[PDB]
């Protein structure tokens, strides 16, 4: 697709037979979800944002579908106020910014 | 231009007659820049993200160039760790996500 930015660029994602939605976030290095369904073992990671730093749960080698495009990469579970797909996964689906 | 996402999408901006650099962030509703003076009167605003909230000054109807492309809109100023161009201005220059 070619997605304009008049509203938040939320898209359907699928992980482990759960459908969720998440924002395509060019300002995020990482992909951060509030929760995943029974994802298992993880390691701690710190990330930052405008308000400070948060501790998150890092899961590697996650198979995800983003708007029907298959990808694999790291997903963080943490206290983000909106689920976000960051550049680690945007690159995998060939996403660019264009103007 | 077409901007791939293997690194942060930092671009040149011009605001207040000064060249700066800022992150094009599709996960930002609004534009937030580090402390500067701007013309006109400001009003106080809160914005949120990862790690919590921050206090900013809101300036309306500000001229900004983003890679030479003119926009006019709201610019927030405050203690952000990086200058961020959000959707309020990305839309004005016709920026889209493409995959």
């Amino acid at each position: 697709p070619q997605i304009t930015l008049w509203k938040r660029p939320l898209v359907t994602i699928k992980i482990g037979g759960q459908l969720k939605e998440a924002l395509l976030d060019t300002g995020a290095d990482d992909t951060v979800l509030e929760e995943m369904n029974l994802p298992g073992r993880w390691k701690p990671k710190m990330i930052g944002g405008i308000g400070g730093f948060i501790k998150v749960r890092q899961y590697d080698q996650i198979l995800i579908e983003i708007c029907g495009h298959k990808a694999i990469g790291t997903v963080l579970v943490g206290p983000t106020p909106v689920n976000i797909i960051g550049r680690n996964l945007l690159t995998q689906i060939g996403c660019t910014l264009n103007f | 231009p077409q901007i791939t996402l293997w690194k942060r999408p930092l671009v040149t901006i011009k605001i207040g007659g000064q060249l700066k650099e800022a992150l094009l962030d599709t996960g930002a509703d609004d534009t937030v820049l580090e402390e500067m003076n701007l013309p006109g009167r400001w009003k106080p605003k809160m914005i949120g993200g990862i790690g919590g909230f921050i206090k900013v000054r809101q300036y309306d109807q500000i001229l900004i160039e983003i890679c030479g492309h003119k926009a006019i809109g709201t610019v927030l100023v405050g203690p952000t760790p990086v200058n961020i161009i959000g959707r309020n201005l990305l839309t004005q220059i016709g920026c889209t996500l493409n995959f």
Binding site: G86 | A28, G48
Partner: peptide, 6 residues
């Protein structure tokens, strides 16, 4: 608003 991750 919301501004998103380093």
């Amino acid at each position: 608003x919301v501004v998103x991750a380093x």
